[PDB]
mmCIF file of C-alpha atoms and ligand atoms in Angstrom:
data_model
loop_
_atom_site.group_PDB
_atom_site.id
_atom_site.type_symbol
_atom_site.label_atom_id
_atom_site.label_comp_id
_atom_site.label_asym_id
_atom_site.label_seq_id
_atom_site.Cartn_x
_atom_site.Cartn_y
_atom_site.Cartn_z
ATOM 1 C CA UNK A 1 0.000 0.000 0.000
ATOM 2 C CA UNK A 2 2.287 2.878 1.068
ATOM 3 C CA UNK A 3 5.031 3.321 -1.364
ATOM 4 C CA UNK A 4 1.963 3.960 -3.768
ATOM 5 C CA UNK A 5 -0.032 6.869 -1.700
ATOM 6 C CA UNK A 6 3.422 8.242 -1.180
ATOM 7 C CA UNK A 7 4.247 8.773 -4.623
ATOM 8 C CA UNK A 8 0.556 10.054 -5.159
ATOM 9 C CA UNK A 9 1.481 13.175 -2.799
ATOM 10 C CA UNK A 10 4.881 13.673 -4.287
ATOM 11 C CA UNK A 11 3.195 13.904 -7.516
ATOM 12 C CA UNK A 12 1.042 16.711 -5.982
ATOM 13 C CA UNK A 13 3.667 18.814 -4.458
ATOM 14 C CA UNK A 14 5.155 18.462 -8.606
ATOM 15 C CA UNK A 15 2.830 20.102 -9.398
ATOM 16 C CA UNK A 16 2.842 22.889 -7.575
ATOM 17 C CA UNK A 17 6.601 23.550 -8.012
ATOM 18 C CA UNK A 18 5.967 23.662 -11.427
ATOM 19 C CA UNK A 19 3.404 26.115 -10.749
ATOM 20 C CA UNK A 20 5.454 28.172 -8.775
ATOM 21 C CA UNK A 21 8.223 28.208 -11.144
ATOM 22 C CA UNK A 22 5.758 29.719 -14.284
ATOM 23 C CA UNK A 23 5.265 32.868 -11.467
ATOM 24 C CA UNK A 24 8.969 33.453 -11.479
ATOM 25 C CA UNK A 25 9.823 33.317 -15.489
ATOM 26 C CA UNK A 26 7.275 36.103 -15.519
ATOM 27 C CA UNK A 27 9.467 38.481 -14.590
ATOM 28 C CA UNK A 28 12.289 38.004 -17.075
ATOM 29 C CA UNK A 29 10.020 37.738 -20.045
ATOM 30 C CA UNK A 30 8.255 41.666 -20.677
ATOM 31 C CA UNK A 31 9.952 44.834 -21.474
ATOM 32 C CA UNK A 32 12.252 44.153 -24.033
ATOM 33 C CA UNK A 33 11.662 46.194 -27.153
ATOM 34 C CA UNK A 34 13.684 47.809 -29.244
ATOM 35 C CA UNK A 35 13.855 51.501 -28.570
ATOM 36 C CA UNK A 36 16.976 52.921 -30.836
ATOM 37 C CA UNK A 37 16.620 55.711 -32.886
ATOM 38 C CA UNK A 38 19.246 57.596 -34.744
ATOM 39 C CA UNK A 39 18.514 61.231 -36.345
ATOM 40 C CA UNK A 40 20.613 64.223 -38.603
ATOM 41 C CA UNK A 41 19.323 67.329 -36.353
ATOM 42 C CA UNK A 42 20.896 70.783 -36.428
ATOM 43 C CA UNK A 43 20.043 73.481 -34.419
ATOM 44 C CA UNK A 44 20.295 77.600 -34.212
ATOM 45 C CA UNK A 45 19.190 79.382 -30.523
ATOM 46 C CA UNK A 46 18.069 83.308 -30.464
ATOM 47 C CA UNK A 47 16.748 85.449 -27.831
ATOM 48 C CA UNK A 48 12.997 84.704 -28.685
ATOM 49 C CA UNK A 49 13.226 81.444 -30.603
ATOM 50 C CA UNK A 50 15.105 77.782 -31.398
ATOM 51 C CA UNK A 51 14.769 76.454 -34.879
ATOM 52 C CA UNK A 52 15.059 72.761 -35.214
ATOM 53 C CA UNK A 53 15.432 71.642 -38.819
ATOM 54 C CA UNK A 54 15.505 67.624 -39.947
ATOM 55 C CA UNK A 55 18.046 66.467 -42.226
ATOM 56 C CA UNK A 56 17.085 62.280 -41.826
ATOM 57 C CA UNK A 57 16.108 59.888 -39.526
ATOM 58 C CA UNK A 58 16.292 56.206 -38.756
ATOM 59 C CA UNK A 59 12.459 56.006 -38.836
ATOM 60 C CA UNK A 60 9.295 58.229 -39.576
ATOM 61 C CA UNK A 61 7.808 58.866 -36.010
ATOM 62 C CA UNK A 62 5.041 61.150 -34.521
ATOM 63 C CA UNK A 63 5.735 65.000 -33.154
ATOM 64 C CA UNK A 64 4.044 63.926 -30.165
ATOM 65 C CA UNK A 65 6.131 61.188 -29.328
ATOM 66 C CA UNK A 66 8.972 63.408 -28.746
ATOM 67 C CA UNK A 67 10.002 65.159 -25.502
ATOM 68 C CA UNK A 68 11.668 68.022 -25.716
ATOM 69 C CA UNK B 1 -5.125 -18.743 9.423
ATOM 70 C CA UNK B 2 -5.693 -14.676 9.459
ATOM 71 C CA UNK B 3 -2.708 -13.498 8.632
ATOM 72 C CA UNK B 4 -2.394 -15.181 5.511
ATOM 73 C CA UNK B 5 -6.071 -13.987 4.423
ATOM 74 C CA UNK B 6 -5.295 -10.476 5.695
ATOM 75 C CA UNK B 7 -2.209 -10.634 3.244
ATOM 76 C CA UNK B 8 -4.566 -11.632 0.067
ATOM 77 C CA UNK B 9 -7.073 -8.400 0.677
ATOM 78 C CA UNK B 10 -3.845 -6.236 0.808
ATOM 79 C CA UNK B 11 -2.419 -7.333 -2.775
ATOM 80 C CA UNK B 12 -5.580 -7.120 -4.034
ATOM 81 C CA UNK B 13 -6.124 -3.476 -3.061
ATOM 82 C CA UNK B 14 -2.601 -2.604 -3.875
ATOM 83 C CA UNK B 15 -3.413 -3.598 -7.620
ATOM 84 C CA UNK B 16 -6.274 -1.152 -7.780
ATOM 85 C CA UNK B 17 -4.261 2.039 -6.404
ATOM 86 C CA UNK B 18 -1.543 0.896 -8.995
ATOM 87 C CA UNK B 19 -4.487 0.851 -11.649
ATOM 88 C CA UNK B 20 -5.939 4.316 -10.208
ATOM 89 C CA UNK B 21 -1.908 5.834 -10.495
ATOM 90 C CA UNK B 22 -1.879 4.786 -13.985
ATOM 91 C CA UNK B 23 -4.437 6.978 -15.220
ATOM 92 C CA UNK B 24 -3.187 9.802 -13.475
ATOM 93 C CA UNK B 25 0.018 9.939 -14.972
ATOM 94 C CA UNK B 26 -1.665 9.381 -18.576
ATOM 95 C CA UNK B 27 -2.850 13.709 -18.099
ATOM 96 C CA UNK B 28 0.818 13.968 -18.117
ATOM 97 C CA UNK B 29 2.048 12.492 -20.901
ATOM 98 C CA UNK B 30 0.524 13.991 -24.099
ATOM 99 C CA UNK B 31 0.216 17.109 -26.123
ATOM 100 C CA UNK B 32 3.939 17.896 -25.514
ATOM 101 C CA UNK B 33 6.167 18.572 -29.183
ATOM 102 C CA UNK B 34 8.059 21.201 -31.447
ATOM 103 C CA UNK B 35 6.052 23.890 -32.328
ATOM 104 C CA UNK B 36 9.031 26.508 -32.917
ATOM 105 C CA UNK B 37 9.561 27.963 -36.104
ATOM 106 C CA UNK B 38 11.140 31.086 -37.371
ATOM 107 C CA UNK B 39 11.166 33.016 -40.684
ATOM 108 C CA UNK B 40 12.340 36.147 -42.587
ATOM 109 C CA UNK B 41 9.697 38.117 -43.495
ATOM 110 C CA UNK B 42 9.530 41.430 -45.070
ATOM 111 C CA UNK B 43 5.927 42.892 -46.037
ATOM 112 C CA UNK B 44 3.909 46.012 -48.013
ATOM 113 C CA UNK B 45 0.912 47.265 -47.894
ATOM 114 C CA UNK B 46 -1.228 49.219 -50.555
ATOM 115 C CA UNK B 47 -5.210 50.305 -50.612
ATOM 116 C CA UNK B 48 -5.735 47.448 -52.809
ATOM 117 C CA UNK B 49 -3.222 44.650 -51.650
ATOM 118 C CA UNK B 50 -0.799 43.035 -49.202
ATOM 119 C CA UNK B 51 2.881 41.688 -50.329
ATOM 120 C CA UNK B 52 4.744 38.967 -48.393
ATOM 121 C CA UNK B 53 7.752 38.039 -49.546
ATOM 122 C CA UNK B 54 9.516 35.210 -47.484
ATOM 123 C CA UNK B 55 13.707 35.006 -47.781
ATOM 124 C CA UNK B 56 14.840 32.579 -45.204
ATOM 125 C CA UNK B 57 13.063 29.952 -42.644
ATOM 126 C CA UNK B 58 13.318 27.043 -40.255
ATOM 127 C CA UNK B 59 11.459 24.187 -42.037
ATOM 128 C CA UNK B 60 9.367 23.798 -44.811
ATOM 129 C CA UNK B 61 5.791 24.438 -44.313
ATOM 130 C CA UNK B 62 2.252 23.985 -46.617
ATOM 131 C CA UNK B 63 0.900 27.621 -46.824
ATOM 132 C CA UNK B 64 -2.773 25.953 -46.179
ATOM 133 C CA UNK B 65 -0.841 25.420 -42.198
ATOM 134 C CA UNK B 66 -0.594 28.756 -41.337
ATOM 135 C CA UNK B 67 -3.286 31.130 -40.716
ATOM 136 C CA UNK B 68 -3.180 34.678 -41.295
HETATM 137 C C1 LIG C 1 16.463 75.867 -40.513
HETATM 138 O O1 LIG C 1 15.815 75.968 -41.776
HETATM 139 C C2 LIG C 1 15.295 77.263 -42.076
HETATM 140 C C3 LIG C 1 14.596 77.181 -43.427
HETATM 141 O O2 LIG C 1 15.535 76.865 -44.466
HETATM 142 C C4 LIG C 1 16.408 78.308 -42.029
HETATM 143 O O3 LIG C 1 17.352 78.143 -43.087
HETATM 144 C C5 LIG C 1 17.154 78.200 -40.707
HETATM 145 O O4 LIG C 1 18.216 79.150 -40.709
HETATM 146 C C6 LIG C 1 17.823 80.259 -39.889
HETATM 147 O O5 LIG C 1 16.775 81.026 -40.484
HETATM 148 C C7 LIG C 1 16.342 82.142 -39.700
HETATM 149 C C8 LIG C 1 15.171 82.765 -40.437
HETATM 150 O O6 LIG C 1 15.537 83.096 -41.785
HETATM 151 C C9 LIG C 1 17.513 83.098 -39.500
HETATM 152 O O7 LIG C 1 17.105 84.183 -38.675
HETATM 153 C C10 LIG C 1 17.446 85.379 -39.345
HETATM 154 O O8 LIG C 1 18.735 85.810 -38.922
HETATM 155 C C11 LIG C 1 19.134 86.982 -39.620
HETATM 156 C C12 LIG C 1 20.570 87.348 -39.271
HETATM 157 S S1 LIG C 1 21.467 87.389 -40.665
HETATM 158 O O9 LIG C 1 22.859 87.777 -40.343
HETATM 159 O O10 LIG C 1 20.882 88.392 -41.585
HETATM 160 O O11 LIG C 1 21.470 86.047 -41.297
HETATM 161 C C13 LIG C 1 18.182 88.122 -39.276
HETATM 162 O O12 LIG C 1 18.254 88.412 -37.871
HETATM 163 C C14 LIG C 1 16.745 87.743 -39.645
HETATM 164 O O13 LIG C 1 15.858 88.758 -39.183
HETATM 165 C C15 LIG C 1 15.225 89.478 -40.227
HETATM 166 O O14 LIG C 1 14.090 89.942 -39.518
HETATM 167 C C16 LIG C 1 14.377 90.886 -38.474
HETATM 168 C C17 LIG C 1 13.064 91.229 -37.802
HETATM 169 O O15 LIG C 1 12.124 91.474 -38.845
HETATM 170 C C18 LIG C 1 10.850 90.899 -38.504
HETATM 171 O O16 LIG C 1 10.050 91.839 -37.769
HETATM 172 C C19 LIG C 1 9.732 93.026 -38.501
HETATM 173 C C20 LIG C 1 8.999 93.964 -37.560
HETATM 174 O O17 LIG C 1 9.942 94.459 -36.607
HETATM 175 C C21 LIG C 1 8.925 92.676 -39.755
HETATM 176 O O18 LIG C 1 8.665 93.850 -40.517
HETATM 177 C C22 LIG C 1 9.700 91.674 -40.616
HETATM 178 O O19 LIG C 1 8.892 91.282 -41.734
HETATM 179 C C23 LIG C 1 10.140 90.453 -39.794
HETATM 180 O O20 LIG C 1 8.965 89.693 -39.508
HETATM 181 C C24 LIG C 1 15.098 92.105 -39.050
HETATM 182 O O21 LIG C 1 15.431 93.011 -38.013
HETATM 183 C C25 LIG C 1 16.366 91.653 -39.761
HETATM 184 O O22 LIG C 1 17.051 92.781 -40.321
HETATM 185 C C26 LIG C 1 18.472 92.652 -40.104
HETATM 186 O O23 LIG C 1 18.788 91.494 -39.309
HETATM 187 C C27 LIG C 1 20.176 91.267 -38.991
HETATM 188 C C28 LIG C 1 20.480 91.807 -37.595
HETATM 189 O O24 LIG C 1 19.690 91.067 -36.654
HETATM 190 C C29 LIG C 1 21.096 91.846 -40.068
HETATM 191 O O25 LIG C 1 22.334 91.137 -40.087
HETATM 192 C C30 LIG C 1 20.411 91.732 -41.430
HETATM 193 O O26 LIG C 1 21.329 92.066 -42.478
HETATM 194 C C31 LIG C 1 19.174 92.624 -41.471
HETATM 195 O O27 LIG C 1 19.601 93.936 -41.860
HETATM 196 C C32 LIG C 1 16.047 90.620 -40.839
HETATM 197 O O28 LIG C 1 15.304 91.284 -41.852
HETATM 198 C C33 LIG C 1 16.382 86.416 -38.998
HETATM 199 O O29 LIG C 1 15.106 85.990 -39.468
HETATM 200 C C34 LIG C 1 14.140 85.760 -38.416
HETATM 201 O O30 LIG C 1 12.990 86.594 -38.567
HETATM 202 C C35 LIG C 1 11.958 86.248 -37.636
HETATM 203 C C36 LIG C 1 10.671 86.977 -38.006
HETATM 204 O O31 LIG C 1 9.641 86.579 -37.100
HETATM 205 C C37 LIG C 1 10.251 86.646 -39.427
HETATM 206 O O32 LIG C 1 10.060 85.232 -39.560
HETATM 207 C C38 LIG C 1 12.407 86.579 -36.211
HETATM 208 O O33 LIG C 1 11.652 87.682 -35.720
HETATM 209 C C39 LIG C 1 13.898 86.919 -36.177
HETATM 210 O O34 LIG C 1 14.085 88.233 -36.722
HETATM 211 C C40 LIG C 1 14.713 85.922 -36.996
HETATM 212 O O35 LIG C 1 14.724 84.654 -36.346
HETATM 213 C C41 LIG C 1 18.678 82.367 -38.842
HETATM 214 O O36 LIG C 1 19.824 83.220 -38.773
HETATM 215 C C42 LIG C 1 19.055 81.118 -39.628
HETATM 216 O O37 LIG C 1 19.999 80.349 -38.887
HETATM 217 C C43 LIG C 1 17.666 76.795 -40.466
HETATM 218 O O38 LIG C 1 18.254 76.766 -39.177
HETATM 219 C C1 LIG C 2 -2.104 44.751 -29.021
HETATM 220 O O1 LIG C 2 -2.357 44.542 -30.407
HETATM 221 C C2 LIG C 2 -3.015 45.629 -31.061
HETATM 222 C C3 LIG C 2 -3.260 45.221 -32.509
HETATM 223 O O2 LIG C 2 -2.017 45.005 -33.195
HETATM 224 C C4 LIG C 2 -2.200 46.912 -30.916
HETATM 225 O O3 LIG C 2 -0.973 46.858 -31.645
HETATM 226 C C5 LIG C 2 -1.870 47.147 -29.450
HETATM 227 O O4 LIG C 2 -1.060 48.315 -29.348
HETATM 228 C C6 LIG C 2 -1.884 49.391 -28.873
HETATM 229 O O5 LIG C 2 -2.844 49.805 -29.845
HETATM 230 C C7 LIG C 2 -3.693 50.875 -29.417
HETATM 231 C C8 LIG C 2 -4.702 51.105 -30.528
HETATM 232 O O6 LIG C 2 -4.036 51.343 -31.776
HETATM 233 C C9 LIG C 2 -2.838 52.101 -29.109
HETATM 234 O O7 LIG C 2 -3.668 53.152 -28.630
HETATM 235 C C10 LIG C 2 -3.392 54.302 -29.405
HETATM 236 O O8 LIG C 2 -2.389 55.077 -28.755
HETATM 237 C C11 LIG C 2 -2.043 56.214 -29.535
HETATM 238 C C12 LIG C 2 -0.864 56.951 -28.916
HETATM 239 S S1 LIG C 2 0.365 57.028 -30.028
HETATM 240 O O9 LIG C 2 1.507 57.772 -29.450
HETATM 241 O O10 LIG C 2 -0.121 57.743 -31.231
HETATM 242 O O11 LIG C 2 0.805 55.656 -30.381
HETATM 243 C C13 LIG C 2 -3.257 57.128 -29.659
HETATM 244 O O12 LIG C 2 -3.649 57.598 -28.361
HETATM 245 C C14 LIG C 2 -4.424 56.373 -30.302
HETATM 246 O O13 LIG C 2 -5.587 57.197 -30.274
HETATM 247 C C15 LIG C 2 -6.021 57.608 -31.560
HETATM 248 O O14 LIG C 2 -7.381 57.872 -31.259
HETATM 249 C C16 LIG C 2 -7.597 58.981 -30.370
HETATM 250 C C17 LIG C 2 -9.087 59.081 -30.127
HETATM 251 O O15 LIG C 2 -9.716 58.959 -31.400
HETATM 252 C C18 LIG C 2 -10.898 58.144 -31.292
HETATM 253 O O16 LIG C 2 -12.041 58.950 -30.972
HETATM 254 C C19 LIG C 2 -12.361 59.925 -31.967
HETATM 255 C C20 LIG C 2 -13.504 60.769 -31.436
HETATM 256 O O17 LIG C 2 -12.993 61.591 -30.383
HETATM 257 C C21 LIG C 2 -12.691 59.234 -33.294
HETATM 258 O O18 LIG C 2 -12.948 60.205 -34.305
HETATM 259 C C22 LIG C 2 -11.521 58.346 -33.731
HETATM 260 O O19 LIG C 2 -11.885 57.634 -34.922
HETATM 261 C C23 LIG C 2 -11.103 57.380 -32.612
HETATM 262 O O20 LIG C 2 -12.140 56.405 -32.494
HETATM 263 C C24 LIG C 2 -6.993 60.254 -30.960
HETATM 264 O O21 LIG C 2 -7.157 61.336 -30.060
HETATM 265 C C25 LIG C 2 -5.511 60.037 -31.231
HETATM 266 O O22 LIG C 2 -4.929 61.215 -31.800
HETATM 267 C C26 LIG C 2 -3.634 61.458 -31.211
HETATM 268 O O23 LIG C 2 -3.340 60.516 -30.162
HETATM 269 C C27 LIG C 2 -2.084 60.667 -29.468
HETATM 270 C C28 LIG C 2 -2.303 61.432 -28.165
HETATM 271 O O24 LIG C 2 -3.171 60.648 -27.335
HETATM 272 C C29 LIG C 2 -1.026 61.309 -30.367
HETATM 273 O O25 LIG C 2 0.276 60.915 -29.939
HETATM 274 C C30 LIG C 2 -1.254 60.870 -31.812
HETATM 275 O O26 LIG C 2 -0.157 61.283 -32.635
HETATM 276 C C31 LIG C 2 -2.577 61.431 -32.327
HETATM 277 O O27 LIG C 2 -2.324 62.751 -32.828
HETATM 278 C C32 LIG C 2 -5.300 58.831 -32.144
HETATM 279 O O28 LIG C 2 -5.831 59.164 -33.419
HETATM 280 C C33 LIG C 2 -4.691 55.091 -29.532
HETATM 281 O O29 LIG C 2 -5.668 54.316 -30.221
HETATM 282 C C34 LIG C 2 -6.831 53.996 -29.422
HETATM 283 O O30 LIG C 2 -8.030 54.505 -30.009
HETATM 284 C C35 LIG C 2 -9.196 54.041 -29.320
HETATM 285 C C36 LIG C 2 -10.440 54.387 -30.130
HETATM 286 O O31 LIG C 2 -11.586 53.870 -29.453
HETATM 287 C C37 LIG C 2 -10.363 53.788 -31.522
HETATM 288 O O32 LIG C 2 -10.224 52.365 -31.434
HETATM 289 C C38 LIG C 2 -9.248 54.645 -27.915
HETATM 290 O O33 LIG C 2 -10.313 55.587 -27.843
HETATM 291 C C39 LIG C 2 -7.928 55.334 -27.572
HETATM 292 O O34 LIG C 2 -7.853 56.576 -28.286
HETATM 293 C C40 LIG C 2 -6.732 54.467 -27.959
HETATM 294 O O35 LIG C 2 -6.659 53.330 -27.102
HETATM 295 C C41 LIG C 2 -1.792 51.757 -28.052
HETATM 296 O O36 LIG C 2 -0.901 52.859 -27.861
HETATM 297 C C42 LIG C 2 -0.972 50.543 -28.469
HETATM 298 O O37 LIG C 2 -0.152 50.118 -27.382
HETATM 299 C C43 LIG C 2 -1.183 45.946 -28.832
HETATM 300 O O38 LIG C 2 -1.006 46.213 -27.451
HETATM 301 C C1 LIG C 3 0.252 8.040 -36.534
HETATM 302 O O1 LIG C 3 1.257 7.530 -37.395
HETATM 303 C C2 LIG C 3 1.016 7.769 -38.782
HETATM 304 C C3 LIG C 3 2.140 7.102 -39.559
HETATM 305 O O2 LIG C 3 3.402 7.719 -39.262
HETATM 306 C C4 LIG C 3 0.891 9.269 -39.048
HETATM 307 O O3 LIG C 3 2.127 9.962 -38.856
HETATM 308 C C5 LIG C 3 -0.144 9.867 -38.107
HETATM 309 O O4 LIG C 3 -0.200 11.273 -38.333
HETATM 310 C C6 LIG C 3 -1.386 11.551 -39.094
HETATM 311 O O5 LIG C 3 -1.298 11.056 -40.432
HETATM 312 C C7 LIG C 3 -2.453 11.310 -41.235
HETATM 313 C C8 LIG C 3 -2.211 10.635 -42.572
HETATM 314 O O6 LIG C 3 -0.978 11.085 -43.153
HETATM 315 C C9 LIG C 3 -2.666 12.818 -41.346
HETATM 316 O O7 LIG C 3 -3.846 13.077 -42.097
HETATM 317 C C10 LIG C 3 -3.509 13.982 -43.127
HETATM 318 O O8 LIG C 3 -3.747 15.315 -42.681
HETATM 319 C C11 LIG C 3 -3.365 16.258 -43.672
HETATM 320 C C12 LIG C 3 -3.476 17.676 -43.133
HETATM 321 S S1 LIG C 3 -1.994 18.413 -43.250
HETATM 322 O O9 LIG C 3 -2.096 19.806 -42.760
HETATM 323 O O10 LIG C 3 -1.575 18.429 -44.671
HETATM 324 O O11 LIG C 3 -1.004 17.678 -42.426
HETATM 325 C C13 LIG C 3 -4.235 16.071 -44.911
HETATM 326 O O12 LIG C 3 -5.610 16.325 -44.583
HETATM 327 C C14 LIG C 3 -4.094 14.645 -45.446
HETATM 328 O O13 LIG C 3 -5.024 14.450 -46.510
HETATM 329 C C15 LIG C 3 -4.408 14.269 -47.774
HETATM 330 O O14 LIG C 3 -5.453 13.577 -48.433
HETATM 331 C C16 LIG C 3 -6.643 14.349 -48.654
HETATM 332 C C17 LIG C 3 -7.660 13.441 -49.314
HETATM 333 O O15 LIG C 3 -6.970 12.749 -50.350
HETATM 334 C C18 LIG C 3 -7.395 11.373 -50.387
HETATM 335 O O16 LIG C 3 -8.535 11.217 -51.248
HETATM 336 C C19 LIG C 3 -8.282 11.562 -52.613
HETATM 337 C C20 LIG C 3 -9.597 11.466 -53.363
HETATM 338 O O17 LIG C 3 -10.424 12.555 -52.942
HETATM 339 C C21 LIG C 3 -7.192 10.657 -53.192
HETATM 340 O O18 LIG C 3 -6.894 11.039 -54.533
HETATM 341 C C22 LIG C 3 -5.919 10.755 -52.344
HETATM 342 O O19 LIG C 3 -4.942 9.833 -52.841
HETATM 343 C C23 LIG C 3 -6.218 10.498 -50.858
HETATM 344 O O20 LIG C 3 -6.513 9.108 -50.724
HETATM 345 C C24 LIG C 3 -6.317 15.594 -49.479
HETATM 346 O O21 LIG C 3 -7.480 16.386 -49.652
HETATM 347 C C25 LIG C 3 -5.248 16.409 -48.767
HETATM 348 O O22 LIG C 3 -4.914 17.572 -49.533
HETATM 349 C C26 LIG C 3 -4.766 18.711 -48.659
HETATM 350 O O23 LIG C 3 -5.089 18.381 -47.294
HETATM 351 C C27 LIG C 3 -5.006 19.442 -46.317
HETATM 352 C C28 LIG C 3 -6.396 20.026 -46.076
HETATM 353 O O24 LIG C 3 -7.224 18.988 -45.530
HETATM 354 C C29 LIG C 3 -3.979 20.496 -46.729
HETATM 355 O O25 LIG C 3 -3.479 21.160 -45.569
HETATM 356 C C30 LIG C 3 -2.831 19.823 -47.479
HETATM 357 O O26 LIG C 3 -1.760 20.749 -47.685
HETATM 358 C C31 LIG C 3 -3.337 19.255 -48.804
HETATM 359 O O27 LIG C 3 -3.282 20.310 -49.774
HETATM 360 C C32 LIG C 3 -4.007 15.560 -48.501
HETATM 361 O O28 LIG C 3 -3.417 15.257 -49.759
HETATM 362 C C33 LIG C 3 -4.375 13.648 -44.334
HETATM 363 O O29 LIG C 3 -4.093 12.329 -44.793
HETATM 364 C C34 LIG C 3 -5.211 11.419 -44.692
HETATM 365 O O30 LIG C 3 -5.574 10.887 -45.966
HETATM 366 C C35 LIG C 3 -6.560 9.855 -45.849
HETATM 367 C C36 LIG C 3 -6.717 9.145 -47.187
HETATM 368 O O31 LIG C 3 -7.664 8.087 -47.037
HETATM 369 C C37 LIG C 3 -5.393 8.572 -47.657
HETATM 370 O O32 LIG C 3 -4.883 7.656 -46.679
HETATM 371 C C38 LIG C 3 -7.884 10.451 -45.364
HETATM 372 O O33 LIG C 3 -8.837 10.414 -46.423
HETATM 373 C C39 LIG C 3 -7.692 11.894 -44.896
HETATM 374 O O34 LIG C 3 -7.539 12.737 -46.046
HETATM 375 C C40 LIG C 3 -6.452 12.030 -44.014
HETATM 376 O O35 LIG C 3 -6.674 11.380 -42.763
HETATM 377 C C41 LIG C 3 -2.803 13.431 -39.955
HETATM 378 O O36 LIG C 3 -2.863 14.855 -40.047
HETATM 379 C C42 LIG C 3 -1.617 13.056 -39.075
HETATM 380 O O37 LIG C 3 -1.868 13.462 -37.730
HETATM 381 C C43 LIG C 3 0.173 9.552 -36.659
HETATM 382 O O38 LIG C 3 -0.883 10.066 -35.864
#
């Protein structure tokens, strides 16, 4: 009889292990993205204004996505 | 006499807990495989149509297996 039941709860305690284990890999696999960005910019400053003019870029991207 | 009889009612349950284990491990052991695959892809899109033109990938696949 015992050797039996005793692998019964072993198999249950697997389990949650296994479980466990799922909760930690979580935290390795989100925010990677890739983020780079590469642009020709030149500049000229004044007492009343900056001009910002665009020579190229490494990709077209919204004026609102930009912090300035 | 008894302890021989009390012997014969033990092996006979002992069968059925082996019989009950085997059909607990059988939730186990399926539905496990390859499913990885990895191609190089490069795409345009127009008001009218959609071009995918495929340069590299891991195995040959039908084009009726993949949905889109
Ligand atoms: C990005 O890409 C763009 C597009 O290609 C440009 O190439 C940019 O390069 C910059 O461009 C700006 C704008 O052209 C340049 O700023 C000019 O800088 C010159 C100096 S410079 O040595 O001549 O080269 C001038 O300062 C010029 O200013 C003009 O306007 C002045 C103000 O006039 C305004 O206001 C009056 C009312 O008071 C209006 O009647 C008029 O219509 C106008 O709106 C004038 O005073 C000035 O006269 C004298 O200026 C200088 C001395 O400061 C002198 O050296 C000159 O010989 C001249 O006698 C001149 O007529 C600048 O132009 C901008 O004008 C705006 C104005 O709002 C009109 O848009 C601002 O008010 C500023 O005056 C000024 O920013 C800059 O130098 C370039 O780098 C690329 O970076
Ligand atoms: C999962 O997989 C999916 C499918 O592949 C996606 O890839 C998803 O990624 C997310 O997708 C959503 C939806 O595309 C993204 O949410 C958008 O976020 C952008 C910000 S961003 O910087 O431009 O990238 C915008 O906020 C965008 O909103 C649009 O809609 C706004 C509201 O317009 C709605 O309502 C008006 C009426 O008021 C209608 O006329 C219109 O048709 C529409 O229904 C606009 O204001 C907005 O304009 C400006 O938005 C931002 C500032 O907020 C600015 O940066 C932009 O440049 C632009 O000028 C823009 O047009 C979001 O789209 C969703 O739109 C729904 C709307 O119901 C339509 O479905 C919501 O109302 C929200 O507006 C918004 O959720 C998200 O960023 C992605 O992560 C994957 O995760
Ligand atoms: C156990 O171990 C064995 C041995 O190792 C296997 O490995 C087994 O794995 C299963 O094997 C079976 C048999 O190979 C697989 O069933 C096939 O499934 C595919 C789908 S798949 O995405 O391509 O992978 C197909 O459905 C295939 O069917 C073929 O036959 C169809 C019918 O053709 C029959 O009838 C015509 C007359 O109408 C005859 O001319 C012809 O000779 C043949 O007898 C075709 O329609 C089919 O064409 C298209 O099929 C699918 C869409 O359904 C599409 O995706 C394909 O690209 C293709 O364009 C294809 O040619 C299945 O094979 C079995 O064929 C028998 C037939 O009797 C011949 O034996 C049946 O009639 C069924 O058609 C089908 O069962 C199964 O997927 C595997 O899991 C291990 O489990």
């Amino acid at each position: 009889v015992s050797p039996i039941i005793a692998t019964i709860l072993l198999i249950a305690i697997t389990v949650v292990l296994a479980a466990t284990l799922v909760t930690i890999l979580g935290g390795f696999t989100h925010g990677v993205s890739n983020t780079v960005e590469t642009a020709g910019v030149t500049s000229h400053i004044t007492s009343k204004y900056i001009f910002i003019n665009v020579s190229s870029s490494s990709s077209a991207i919204s004026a609102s996505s930009i912090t300035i």
